[PDB]
Design an enzyme around this catalytic site. Sequence first.
Site, PDB file in Angstrom:
ATOM      1  CD  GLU C 186      -5.373  -5.511   2.197  1.00  0.00           C
ATOM      2  OE1 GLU C 186      -6.083  -6.384   2.722  1.00  0.00           O
ATOM      3  OE2 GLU C 186      -5.561  -4.291   2.376  1.00  0.00           O
ATOM      4  CE  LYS C 228      -7.542  -5.114  -1.380  1.00  0.00           C
ATOM      5  NZ  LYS C 228      -8.965  -5.222  -0.965  1.00  0.00           N
TER       6      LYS C 228
END
Lengths: 343, 343, 343, 343
Positions: C186, C228
């Site tokens: 992420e 992400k």
Amino acid sequence: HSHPALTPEQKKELSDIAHRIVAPGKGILAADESTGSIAKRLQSIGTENTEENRRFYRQLLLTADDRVNPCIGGVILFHETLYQKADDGRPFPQVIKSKGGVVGIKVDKGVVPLAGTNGETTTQGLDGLSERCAQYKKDGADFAKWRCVLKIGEHTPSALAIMENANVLARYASICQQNGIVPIVEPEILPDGDHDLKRCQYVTEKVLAAVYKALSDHHIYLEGTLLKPNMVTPGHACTQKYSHEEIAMATVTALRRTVPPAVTGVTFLSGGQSEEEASINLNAINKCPLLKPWALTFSYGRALQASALKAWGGKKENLKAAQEEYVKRALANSLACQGKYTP
Amino acid sequence: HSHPALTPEQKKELSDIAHRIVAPGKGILAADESTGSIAKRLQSIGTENTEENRRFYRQLLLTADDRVNPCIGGVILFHETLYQKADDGRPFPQVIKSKGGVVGIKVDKGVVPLAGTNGETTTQGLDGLSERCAQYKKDGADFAKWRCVLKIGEHTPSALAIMENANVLARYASICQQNGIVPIVEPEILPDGDHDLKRCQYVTEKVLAAVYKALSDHHIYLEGTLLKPNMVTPGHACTQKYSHEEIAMATVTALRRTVPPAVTGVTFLSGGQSEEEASINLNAINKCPLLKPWALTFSYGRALQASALKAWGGKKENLKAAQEEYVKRALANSLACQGKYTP
Amino acid sequence: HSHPALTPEQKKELSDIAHRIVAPGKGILAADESTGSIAKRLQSIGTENTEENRRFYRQLLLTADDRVNPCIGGVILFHETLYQKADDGRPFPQVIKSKGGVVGIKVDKGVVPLAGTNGETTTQGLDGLSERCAQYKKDGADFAKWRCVLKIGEHTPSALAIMENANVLARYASICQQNGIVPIVEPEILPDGDHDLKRCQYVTEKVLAAVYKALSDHHIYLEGTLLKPNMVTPGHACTQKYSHEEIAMATVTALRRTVPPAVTGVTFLSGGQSEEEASINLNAINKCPLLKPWALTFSYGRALQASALKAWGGKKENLKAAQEEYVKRALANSLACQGKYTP
Amino acid sequence: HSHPALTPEQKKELSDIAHRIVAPGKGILAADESTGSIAKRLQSIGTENTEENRRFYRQLLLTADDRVNPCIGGVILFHETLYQKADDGRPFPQVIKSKGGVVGIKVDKGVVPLAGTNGETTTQGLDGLSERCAQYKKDGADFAKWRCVLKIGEHTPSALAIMENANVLARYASICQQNGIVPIVEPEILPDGDHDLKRCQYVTEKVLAAVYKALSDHHIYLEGTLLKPNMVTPGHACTQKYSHEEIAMATVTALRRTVPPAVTGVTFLSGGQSEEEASINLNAINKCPLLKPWALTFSYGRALQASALKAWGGKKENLKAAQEEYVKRALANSLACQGKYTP
């Protein structure tokens, strides 16, 4: 744009502590052995590993004669030893600071194997490190230690291992310098195998250059950092034989091609050598006729305490004699710091 | 695995030439001005730019008094000046080597703007460089020069510019060291703008660290390499004023945090300063009370020859007086190499 | 030389889990909120933060209607929620796997400020990670999550922050892939400030390129990795206004210039948007007329559960209605995964 | 901060030219052979190397039948061939553009050995490149070609060679994109030696990842760039045998793990293969059942023209038959672009 990591007072503490550690004629005793390694060492000497024996052995190390007061500038401890007290009632950090020494602590959480490499490992221990260094700073730890491991193999050290270990060392040293603790980077290269002076010198240059590039990347105040490298020495299975002068020339060449001169001092490893060979090599390094613009001293774990542990044997009443033995090596290593050693 | 770039004899020539250049009390005269810059300088003095005037002006520079024999260790030339002869009949390389000097040559082909940056340029001149250095080695050139340009701006120097210029400098120095020619890396940082001592010192550290990482990457024999940095000095539009001692402290801090001590000598730029300010600053740098484990000397293009060019004016019969003027600055700069200068 | 990090069976589990997570029409619910953030959210709704309320709220999230069974492929949990049981008696991992979902766990230990930067932080949580992932693998966690934070400022993101965060993400993903747990990287970029589509798109390209270079460096099996990222969206104080089609074009351009197509799926953040704006933007991204050779889906923490939390209010008897509200957004986001959403 | 390298119109020309080159069913003929390689090829066929024979042979290549008009999108030329005219009176660039083709030019100045490596070379040709590309742009060249060489050895490709070749390719592509010329990067890996599919696939991943990182570093507009890689194929002395489906699977895996999908097309090398093996392998690559989000086509120097050169033999009156032979391979390679080839 520059947002300074350190106030000038922070640079002042880091420089003053680093100068007091590496002061001319002084060295580092590394009593930082964890329970597994010291368990192997107590099992070799033939005693049971308890907290009392470990505390008593570090009592034997730490409260030796006052002749070691101009010998040791600083002692590296395990985490547990910071919270043990001597039988006089004084805690071991106060014992260290009373005779002029500086308290340190080994802070890494071991080695983790890297995926996809050939037996290459990184180091662990970054979580909670700012809080832990704040806590150790409250307890009197003024410097730290972190140990990364690299081995010479067929196609190792790969670029991945050197890059990752350099980035981890720089991250560690930034965190330690934020909290007023002088970091000591230890780029250990494993002496196992069969390789000449040339290849080990080569990988020493690559490793130290990558380390100092990563230190320049993370804004590390290099005047308050100590370096802990190993002496470039052939492998254990290497057949060629070399004089100590060639090893000294190769060490000072591998340092003089890499170490920027603001780094305050260089403390060597013993690295599986004999108790006498390390002192002979360090005395040779301090006699090499090139320009070495830093302090060259010792940080010997086994090479200070191995034969003193042997003369202890696990019995209390031998203590003084064992302690006397320790003092011997320390005095020798002090001369190895100033080049006036002769065996 | 190590395949050595250099035989030990090659390291011996590179080290001997680098020691003979940077020898204590000696410096570098840079008569390497190309036709555009020297055209601007002859147009300022008010004479026509011909081959005869350029040859005669470099005659005025090169055949000065024997008092400059313990002053200049080496002279940097343009390509054209290697094939010009003096009116005595002797070629200028022989003129240089007769009085103890060493012939060099500026070898880059100019600056090329980098796409996507804010006015940042790289340097050109890599093609045919091995053959050209072989040819110049046959003609008596023993060292070289390459000039990369970086400017301090809002968000410049970017990482792209520093990385590309460091890689180009390392590639150049590898090629020059292959042919027995001592390279001189010149990481010039432009003094234009308004910026304090702090930011210029900061970008000096980043640039020099990236340069030495790229030199370690390309197996450069650093004992046979000279460094040509600029003194960290505030911008031309910067309002703050600083003593020369602060500039000297900042220069020796920016070097002592980066330069590994096997690099044989450090020759400074003048960088748009006055004729006297550069000598004052170099005398301050040689008096800074830190440990500087290399030779600190001058490589002055304009700061040696500007006022002597002014006292020439384009007339032959003024020659000796103009030459006398040149000797003055040279003698001053020689004292600026040894710290015993006083204005 | 190649020593493979993974056996082909290990690649088979990683690929199968990554395909089952990102399966067409399915998305990720992120119930991984720690006690501080969920404490702020329960304090906004006006209830006391206890273990019972947190367990009951995640009961409200997890045991919703069977219409969300072709909606959620996987749920991210806090560490505590793995060891909480539902009132039926079943543990929450079994609750997740019973209706076709996959258990994950957020594993980082927070953010640590980097020295010398302008408010830039790295992420913590690397120690003991192999043992912890082995333990979570025994408890049914098949994927993980790690959250690094970067903010757009005057001269930020610096190269240091992007390099360190990319190296930490790669180290994390190597450790997770060693233990049979599919990692989800992420790379969050903070939407605060005032900056156009252009600069945020630019730093998105730099960050994602550095991330994938570090992933290629650490031998990461990219077929078993999820990405992400956040949607490239102007700053909160930015005055310029943009249609959603321009945001969709910029997102698919910032991905199509960086993401290598073996990376199995791309799950977006909500990033401080409204509950409806994220679904509108994701529906636009799934309608962009370029070639997107991966799965594009949602991983929404707040954008799934915020208004359902509002309709809960801390009272049990409203539950079903609140749960119904949650289902609404989920169904909408499922259409946002397939491009057939229309508000 | 972003200062855009390209105006949107510049991106429009680069994208339109790259789309017209790599258009479905079209490929690249590489008639770019320099005088040494074509001298070896004319000496094998048994004729004297003159300008007339080279011009006549490229006449035989270029003015073939109109059936190759939906076959070749673009032709790569030597520098000399741009200024040769056909016997009709028309210059060869106009000959190429008249039948729908696009003129290119091979622009590098050869390979230079890197110091300290094991027979590893970089590429030369960066000086004057902006002016030369402006000149070739005036003469009708719309794309370019640059060829870097890497060989698989014991401990090669080292990191130094891959880094330097990637930086040089990115610098080249920036310069070409500045002048409105679509660059084609060619990361050639030498097939010599004995190595399996696995190691060659591995070094293909490392090389292509480093190339695309350096392209992201230099702000290269990747929608206007073509990629010229080689098929991952075992060494010439490698004993293991593989079906063509395994080679196709390995190629599409080595591309799908690296190439970001905005790169417009992928043109393969022949790389010392037979005339039929390259077409068989390309037909297999176009039949691999994975998602390949770009154009996959051929850029064959020897594999188009070798047997046609054999059927020429240096005699003019055989011409048509020889030309007919060339058309055969071209038609086959066109089917190899669309996967509908069957031998």
